[PDB]
Design a binder for these strands. Structure first.
Ligand SMILES: [Ca+2]
Ligand SMILES: [Ca+2]
Length: 725
RNA sequence: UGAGGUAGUAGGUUGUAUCGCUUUAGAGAUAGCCAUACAAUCUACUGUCUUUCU
């Protein structure tokens, strides 16, 4: 089926244009940037129980810098959620227009390989480092302040002590004797990443140092109580001896092994702050009594990389993917006005749920459903001077089906730019400077499969974001650019008396004829001066839905689309429209040949409600209450604000009752009280001339209600059943 | 913050069955938006258990 959720198809991953053809070249200008980490949201000690110090990225002065051959356009300050709290990352230029030589540039490239292959462990048999066939390639090099304090410059005395050390890829060859006892230097291990030598010869385990335990010595650690001392442990399990028995033990904690840092660990998947209320004493006791690795400096080789830069390196996958999460492919916004929405907002008009990062596609597309319906409806109602409700409902439903929405999103190119998968850097991320998967002589490193429904939903969320930001001219221009055309959008013996009603509603009509149209049938032909109240019911149902949805969206209560649509249906049900049209006296001006239809419900409501239904609901009472809205709208130069001004006094107590009482239909609530045994019997005409429905739930007998149709009959039966429960 | 497994919570996702509301074409049908119950599956957190590391 063309727009079915089932029809999945395969789609590649687009490359931000700035991050392609981006390899630095000899005698080619570079653009040195800076990641710009600054810890502007520490974590609280009422929220952190690691029992471990916080490390701001400002304690030290060496930082990572991209070296694209292409200029990066400034991106909104985005956060990453490291061990030390929400870090606001800012990729802001540091220097530009300088030329490098060959030797230093090959040094840069070798350090880039060392970083992604050796440091981050993103090397797989399938992936081969080729920075000349790769599709996204740029160096990631360290920066420091030397000479002038203001200047940040490429470290060359660093990146040259990585080529003069032999503890980088292997373990240094060293010889310790009892005649030259091992000597300890505190400054060397102050910020150190240490690798154990006695084990994991294939792939060693890295751990940055975070403390020095001075009281702890090689003779008293006893961590696992089956061993007489610490030194005897290396001696029996590895047969290693120590030449210095007065050195301290070197407390230590792992390098981060999971490199998805775009989500917070102790908050919801909603962007909502929520600390846990359980294990409060236990979390502190946990990191206290838990086994913790206490290495020894004798046997651990110090990397040529200090912890202060390893900490900025670990965050490079997430930072280089969020900068890549179309933040730099804001070409969508360049193609699409008050300067457009923030690229942070457009990244919620491309992110689909089950991408689990803190943005949902929905709660922004529901508002898009109401505007597109309203825009299509208004465009039709004014495109043609004559069309019955059947024709317009036909035309509309074709221009707004999921099939057509899908066929318009994919034509734009929206499926590659989307975010459909969860971020796993080793499994489905292709790091920069790496050529697409092959080493073996469909793939998860450059393709993804998305349903046809999801393109049709993002085409809605994008409209929602442009709308809620730039107004209602921007949403219309956006749709018009997709392809959906929305932009080119005796008679004084029964008209006198409308002055009282106009004074009741506090609006005066520039042309009274619209009030007349809003009150005459398409079968009552005594009034031939004006047209039927049928086209107006169409515009008014769309508008009163758009306005109610915009109000509901603008509330700080932040309703999920489920509750939002439940409310929208709770107040646009035509029973309420009948009640509000008879309360404020719409019927007394309403010319019709209805014999006794609305009189019963009028007396019913005016007697019982003096501050569910036991009587039939007139179609007219419900449809005049919302043809008046269309009449105001079409009279007041197509202005939603006069309509909302006139209608908000009436609807205000109703809205502030329903946004707290959130009503629902008796049939659905019955099938939610017990769906196992509840079912409606097929229609069958009784001896009254009615239609009856037989309903049962076990234990309370059988229920029924006669009506003029199957829907009304089962509704009455459901009410009868639900009153007893 | 080593590789797993097993329960719960939170956020999703897929399929299937019963369904609500708005629109109307001539049990029920067209086109939109949810909810509910069962099942499969993924991510983040907490605890518990095995292995490893200290
Ligand atoms: Ca939709
Ligand atoms: Ca209607």
């Amino acid at each position: 089926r063309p727009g079915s959720t089932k029809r999945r198809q395969c789609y590649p991953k687009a490359i931000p244009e700035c991050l392609r053809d981006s390899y630095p070249r000899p005698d080619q200008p570079c653009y040195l940037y800076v990641i710009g980490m600054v810890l502007t949201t520490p974590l609280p000690d009422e929220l952190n129980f690691r029992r471990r110090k916080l490390y701001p990225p400002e304690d030290t002065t060496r930082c990572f810098g991209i070296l694209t051959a292409k200029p990066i356009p400034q991106i909104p300050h985005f956060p990453v959620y490291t061990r030390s709290g929400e870090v606001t990352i800012s990729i802001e230029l540091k220097k530009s227009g300088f030329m490098l030589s060959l030797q230093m540039l090959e040094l840069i490239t070798r350090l880039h390989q060392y970083i992604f292959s050796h440091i981050l462990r993103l090397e797989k048999p399938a992936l081969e480092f080729k920075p000349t066939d790769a599709d996204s390639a740029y160096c990631v090099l360290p920066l420091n302040v030397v000479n002038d304090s203001s200047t940040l410059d490429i470290d060359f005395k660093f990146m040259e002590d990585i080529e003069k050390s032999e503890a980088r890829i292997g373990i240094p060859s060293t010889k310790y004797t009892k005649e030259t006892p091992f000597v300890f230097k505190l400054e060397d291990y102050q910020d150190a990443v240490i690798i154990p030598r006695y084990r994991n010869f294939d792939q060693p385990h890295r751990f940055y140092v975070a403390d020095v335990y001075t009281d702890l010595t090689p003779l008293s650690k006893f961590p696992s109580p089956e061993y007489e001392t610490f030194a005897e442990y290396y001696k029996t399990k590895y047969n290693l001896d120590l030449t210095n028995l007065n050195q301290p033990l070197l407390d230590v904690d792992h390098t981060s092994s999971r490199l998805n840092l775009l989500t917070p660990r102790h908050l919801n998947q909603k962007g909502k702050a929520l600390p846990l209320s359980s294990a409060e004493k236990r979390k502190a006791k946990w990191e206290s009594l838990q086994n913790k690795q206490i290495l020894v400096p004798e046997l651990c080789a110090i990397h040529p990389i200090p912890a202060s830069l390893w900490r900025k390196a670990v965050c490079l996958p997430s930072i280089l993917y969020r900068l890549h999460c179309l933040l730099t492919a804001e070409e969508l916004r360049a193609q699409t006005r008050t300067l457009g929405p923030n690229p942070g907002l457009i990244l919620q008009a491309l992110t689909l749920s089950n991408a689990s990062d803190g943005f949902n596609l929905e709660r922004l597309e529901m508002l898009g459903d109401s505007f597109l319906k309203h825009a299509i409806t208004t465009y039709l109602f004014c495109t043609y001077p004559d069309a019955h409700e059947g024709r317009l409902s036909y035309m509309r439903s074709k221009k707004v089906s999921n099939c057509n929405l899908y066929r318009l999103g994919k034509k734009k190119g929206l499926p590659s730019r989307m975010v459909v998968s969860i971020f796993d850097p080793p499994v489905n991320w292709l790091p920069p400077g790496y050529v697409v998967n092959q080493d073996k002589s469909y793939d998860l490193h450059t393709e993804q499969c998305i349903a046809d429904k999801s393109i049709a939903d993002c085409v809605e969320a994008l409209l929602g974001c442009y709308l809620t930001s730039c107004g209602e001219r921007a949403a219309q221009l956006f749709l018009c650019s997709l392809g959906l055309k929305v932009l080119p959008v005796t008679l004084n013996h029964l008209i006198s008396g409308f002055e009282n009603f106009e004074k009741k509603i506090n609006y005066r009509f520039k042309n009274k004829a619209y009030l007349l149209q809003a009150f005459t049938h398409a079968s009552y032909h005594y009034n031939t001066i004006t047209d039927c109240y049928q086209r107006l019911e169409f515009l008014g149902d769309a508008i009163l839905d758009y306005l109610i949805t915009k109000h509901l969206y603008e509330d700080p209560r932040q309703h999920s689309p489920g509750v939002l649509t439940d409310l929208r249906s709770a107040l646009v049900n035509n029973t309420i429209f009948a009640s509000l049209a008879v309360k404020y006296d719409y019927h007394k001006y309403f010319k019709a040949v209805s014999p006794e239809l609305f009189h019963v419900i009028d007396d019913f409501v005016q007697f019982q409600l003096e501050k569910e239904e036991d009587i039939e609901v007139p179609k007219a009472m419900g449809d005049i209450f919302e043809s008046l809205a269309g009449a105001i709208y079409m009279d007041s130069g197509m202005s939603l604000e006069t309509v909302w001004q006139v209608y908000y006094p009436m609807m205000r107590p109703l809205i502030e009752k329903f946004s707290a009482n959130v009503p629902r239909s008796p049939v659905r609530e019955l099938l939610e009280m017990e769906p196992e045994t509840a079912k409606f019997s097929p229609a069958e005409r009784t001896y009254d001339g009615k239609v009856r429905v037989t309903v049962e739930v076990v234990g309370k007998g059988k229920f029924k209600g006669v009506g003029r149709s199957y829907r009304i009959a089962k509704s009455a039966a459901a009410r009868r059943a639900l009153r007893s429960l």
